[PDB]
Scaffold this active site. Sequence first.
Site, PDB file in Angstrom:
ATOM      1  N   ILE A  22       4.139 -10.909  -5.586  1.00 46.31           N
ATOM      2  CA  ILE A  22       4.393 -10.316  -7.303  1.00 46.31           C
ATOM      3  C   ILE A  22       5.375  -9.439  -7.335  1.00 46.31           C
ATOM      4  O   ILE A  22       6.538  -9.498  -7.959  1.00 46.31           O
ATOM      5  CB  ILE A  22       3.036 -10.020  -7.737  1.00 46.31           C
ATOM      6  CG1 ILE A  22       1.830 -10.988  -7.714  1.00 46.31           C
ATOM      7  CG2 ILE A  22       3.214  -9.630  -9.308  1.00 46.31           C
ATOM      8  CD1 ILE A  22       0.732 -10.542  -8.390  1.00 46.31           C
ATOM      9  N   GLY A  23       5.281  -8.405  -6.343  1.00 44.32           N
ATOM     10  CA  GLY A  23       6.246  -7.329  -6.549  1.00 44.32           C
ATOM     11  C   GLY A  23       5.917  -6.043  -5.746  1.00 44.32           C
ATOM     12  O   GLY A  23       4.851  -6.163  -5.027  1.00 44.32           O
ATOM     13  N   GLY A  25       4.570  -2.212  -5.878  1.00 48.76           N
ATOM     14  CA  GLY A  25       3.845  -1.035  -6.391  1.00 48.76           C
ATOM     15  C   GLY A  25       4.371   0.238  -5.944  1.00 48.76           C
ATOM     16  O   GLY A  25       5.346   0.001  -5.033  1.00 48.76           O
ATOM     17  N   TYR A  27       2.941   2.142  -4.436  1.00 50.45           N
ATOM     18  CA  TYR A  27       2.052   2.853  -3.206  1.00 50.45           C
ATOM     19  C   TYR A  27       2.290   1.500  -1.935  1.00 50.45           C
ATOM     20  O   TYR A  27       1.838   1.777  -0.971  1.00 50.45           O
ATOM     21  CB  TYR A  27       0.717   3.180  -3.458  1.00 50.45           C
ATOM     22  CG  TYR A  27       0.549   4.487  -3.955  1.00 50.45           C
ATOM     23  CD1 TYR A  27       0.339   4.587  -5.478  1.00 50.45           C
ATOM     24  CD2 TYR A  27       0.431   5.750  -3.476  1.00 50.45           C
ATOM     25  CE1 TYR A  27       0.227   5.676  -6.225  1.00 50.45           C
ATOM     26  CE2 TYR A  27       0.099   6.820  -4.101  1.00 50.45           C
ATOM     27  CZ  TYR A  27      -0.030   6.862  -5.608  1.00 50.45           C
ATOM     28  OH  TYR A  27      -0.334   8.111  -6.123  1.00 50.45           O
ATOM     29  N   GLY A  28       2.687   0.247  -2.471  1.00 47.15           N
ATOM     30  CA  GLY A  28       2.706  -0.755  -1.534  1.00 47.15           C
ATOM     31  C   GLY A  28       3.007  -1.903  -2.156  1.00 47.15           C
ATOM     32  O   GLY A  28       2.947  -2.256  -3.420  1.00 47.15           O
ATOM     33  N   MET A  29       3.008  -3.099  -1.353  1.00 48.58           N
ATOM     34  CA  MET A  29       3.252  -4.474  -1.944  1.00 48.58           C
ATOM     35  C   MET A  29       2.061  -5.011  -2.779  1.00 48.58           C
ATOM     36  O   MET A  29       1.131  -4.743  -2.231  1.00 48.58           O
ATOM     37  CB  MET A  29       3.729  -5.263  -0.826  1.00 48.58           C
ATOM     38  CG  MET A  29       3.948  -6.917  -1.044  1.00 48.58           C
ATOM     39  SD  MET A  29       4.539  -7.822   0.226  1.00 48.58           S
ATOM     40  CE  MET A  29       6.012  -7.431   0.587  1.00 48.58           C
ATOM     41  N   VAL A  30       2.319  -5.810  -3.687  1.00 46.77           N
ATOM     42  CA  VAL A  30       1.424  -6.278  -4.565  1.00 46.77           C
ATOM     43  C   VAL A  30       1.593  -7.776  -4.446  1.00 46.77           C
ATOM     44  O   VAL A  30       2.635  -8.361  -5.009  1.00 46.77           O
ATOM     45  CB  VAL A  30       1.485  -5.844  -5.968  1.00 46.77           C
ATOM     46  CG1 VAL A  30       0.577  -6.563  -6.932  1.00 46.77           C
ATOM     47  CG2 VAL A  30       1.217  -4.368  -6.226  1.00 46.77           C
ATOM     48  N   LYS A  45      -3.248  -5.016  -3.890  1.00 48.09           N
ATOM     49  CA  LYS A  45      -2.176  -4.354  -3.407  1.00 48.09           C
ATOM     50  C   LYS A  45      -2.569  -3.815  -1.919  1.00 48.09           C
ATOM     51  O   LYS A  45      -3.386  -3.286  -1.643  1.00 48.09           O
ATOM     52  CB  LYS A  45      -2.044  -3.173  -4.448  1.00 48.09           C
ATOM     53  CG  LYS A  45      -0.941  -1.926  -4.290  1.00 48.09           C
ATOM     54  CD  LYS A  45      -1.048  -0.900  -5.301  1.00 48.09           C
ATOM     55  CE  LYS A  45       0.349  -0.317  -5.227  1.00 48.09           C
ATOM     56  NZ  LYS A  45       0.740   0.739  -6.504  1.00 48.09           N
ATOM     57  N   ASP A 140       2.457  10.856 -16.490  1.00 46.94           N
ATOM     58  CA  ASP A 140       3.598   9.790 -16.119  1.00 46.94           C
ATOM     59  C   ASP A 140       3.499   8.144 -16.581  1.00 46.94           C
ATOM     60  O   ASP A 140       3.573   7.294 -16.216  1.00 46.94           O
ATOM     61  CB  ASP A 140       3.572   9.627 -14.469  1.00 46.94           C
ATOM     62  CG  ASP A 140       4.756   8.933 -13.952  1.00 46.94           C
ATOM     63  OD1 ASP A 140       5.874   9.228 -14.396  1.00 46.94           O
ATOM     64  OD2 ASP A 140       4.513   8.354 -12.957  1.00 46.94           O
TER      65      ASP A 140
HETATM   66  C1  LIG Z   1      -1.324  -0.282  -9.893  1.00 49.62           C
HETATM   67  C2  LIG Z   1      -1.300  -1.566  -9.590  1.00 49.62           C
HETATM   68  C3  LIG Z   1      -0.550  -2.536 -10.047  1.00 49.62           C
HETATM   69  C4  LIG Z   1      -0.769  -3.936  -9.723  1.00 49.62           C
HETATM   70  C5  LIG Z   1      -0.026  -4.708 -10.174  1.00 49.62           C
HETATM   71  N1  LIG Z   1       1.537  -4.930 -10.102  1.00 49.62           N
HETATM   72  N2  LIG Z   1       2.121  -5.586 -10.577  1.00 49.62           N
HETATM   73  C6  LIG Z   1       3.381  -6.081 -10.810  1.00 49.62           C
HETATM   74  C7  LIG Z   1       3.898  -5.115 -11.721  1.00 49.62           C
HETATM   75  C8  LIG Z   1       4.062  -6.054  -9.225  1.00 49.62           C
HETATM   76  C9  LIG Z   1       0.829  -6.599 -11.102  1.00 49.62           C
HETATM   77  N3  LIG Z   1       1.285  -7.913 -11.909  1.00 49.62           N
HETATM   78  C10 LIG Z   1       0.024  -8.527 -12.106  1.00 49.62           C
HETATM   79  N4  LIG Z   1      -1.299  -8.150 -11.709  1.00 49.62           N
HETATM   80  C11 LIG Z   1      -1.302  -6.775 -11.259  1.00 49.62           C
HETATM   81  N5  LIG Z   1      -2.219  -6.346 -11.005  1.00 49.62           N
HETATM   82  C12 LIG Z   1      -0.313  -6.154 -11.011  1.00 49.62           C
HETATM   83  C13 LIG Z   1      -1.794  -4.385  -8.868  1.00 49.62           C
HETATM   84  C14 LIG Z   1      -2.481  -3.264  -8.307  1.00 49.62           C
HETATM   85  C15 LIG Z   1      -3.597  -3.671  -7.361  1.00 49.62           C
HETATM   86  C16 LIG Z   1      -4.382  -2.712  -6.989  1.00 49.62           C
HETATM   87  C17 LIG Z   1      -4.257  -1.464  -7.435  1.00 49.62           C
HETATM   88  O1  LIG Z   1      -5.092  -0.243  -6.902  1.00 49.62           O
HETATM   89  C18 LIG Z   1      -4.923   0.854  -7.573  1.00 49.62           C
HETATM   90  C19 LIG Z   1      -4.722   1.773  -6.351  1.00 49.62           C
HETATM   91  C20 LIG Z   1      -5.846   2.180  -5.597  1.00 49.62           C
HETATM   92  C21 LIG Z   1      -5.753   3.145  -4.527  1.00 49.62           C
HETATM   93  C22 LIG Z   1      -4.372   3.545  -4.417  1.00 49.62           C
HETATM   94  C23 LIG Z   1      -3.422   3.302  -5.229  1.00 49.62           C
HETATM   95  C24 LIG Z   1      -3.487   2.480  -6.154  1.00 49.62           C
HETATM   96  N6  LIG Z   1      -3.331  -1.012  -8.195  1.00 49.62           N
HETATM   97  C25 LIG Z   1      -2.397  -2.110  -8.883  1.00 49.62           C
END
Ligand SMILES: Cc1cc(-c2nn(C(C)C)c3ncnc(N)c23)cc2ccc(OCc3ccccc3)nc12
Length: 342
Positions: A22-23, A25, A27-30, A45, A140
Amino acid sequence: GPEMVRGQVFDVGPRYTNLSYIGEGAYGMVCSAYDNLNKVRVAIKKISPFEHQTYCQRTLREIKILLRFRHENIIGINDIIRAPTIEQMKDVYIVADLMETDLYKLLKTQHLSNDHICYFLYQILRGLKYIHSANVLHRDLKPSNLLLNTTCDLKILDFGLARVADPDTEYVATRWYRAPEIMLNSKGYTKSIDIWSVGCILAEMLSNRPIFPGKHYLDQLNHILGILGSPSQEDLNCIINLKARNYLLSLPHKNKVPWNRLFPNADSKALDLLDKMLTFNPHKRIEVEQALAHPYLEQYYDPSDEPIAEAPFKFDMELDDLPKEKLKELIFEETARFQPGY
Ligand SMILES: Cc1cc(-c2nn(C(C)C)c3ncnc(N)c23)cc2ccc(OCc3ccccc3)nc12
């Protein structure tokens, strides 16, 4: 073996299969994946923080806050995957609902009608109302921290820079949504810093262009003053810091730009609310509950369906600056309740 995406391993099977990029994030690849238990595609993620102190610290903090928060307009954690022994755990996979895009990408690609703007704005403030009710500042908010799905449901992301809202910088991708007071005195005073960030997002929805695109630190304040005008005397007198006040007095005079000159096709109620959100003086800036009750959001305003936190959230600040290896152990413990049990 595990599936791979752009050379990166995603060892999330057998439960999650048929992965697709997808893209990136923060903190890492999603990736997107099929959940074979719930029969639905999800977002996963991948996070690899154990090679640094700051990453382990922010990871632990985010997992704790997102697990305690439960609100439709704030991203939730459905599942967490990691190796069964700490010695094997080199990565952590966080699973969440699959959305369509972020507001950043949507605004680069498409127009938003007034109804979409109005509804998106309502949902940002609905979620923000819950966050502020827990005594937390986001600090933010920006288009890339807002996820949207196909039915126009909106979810807030990224509490990496979040803090308690009582009186007490580093690298970030953009300062375009930072409130003026953050650079003029105490480090992000109050809840009004988030309302400022939300006003900037509103403007960007009206034009598809960021309203205050500063090219460097001091340029950011020039962009803000170039539209709002120079502060009044009353507003100047609220700048407590001696150097900040002097700096403001040394700057060329600028006149206010009328909102309907910048946004000639915008709904006048939207611009009224925008005016109240992008108020220079943070003490006069509109609060979240007042903004929700503004005439512009009359269609959706429903305080019986706008829940608040059960209690204030507390960040244990002493966990910051703990050794890399100790944080690894706490993240193992916090993620333990998602490991196949019973
Ligand atoms: C912030 C965030 C964004 C996305 C996400 N990002 N994106 C795109 C913008 C790349 C998505 N597109 C469709 N559905 C999604 N869920 C996403 C997935 C995520 C999947 C898991 C996640 O865990 C939050 C987290 C936990 C622990 C440490 C850091 C972040 N965070 C996510």
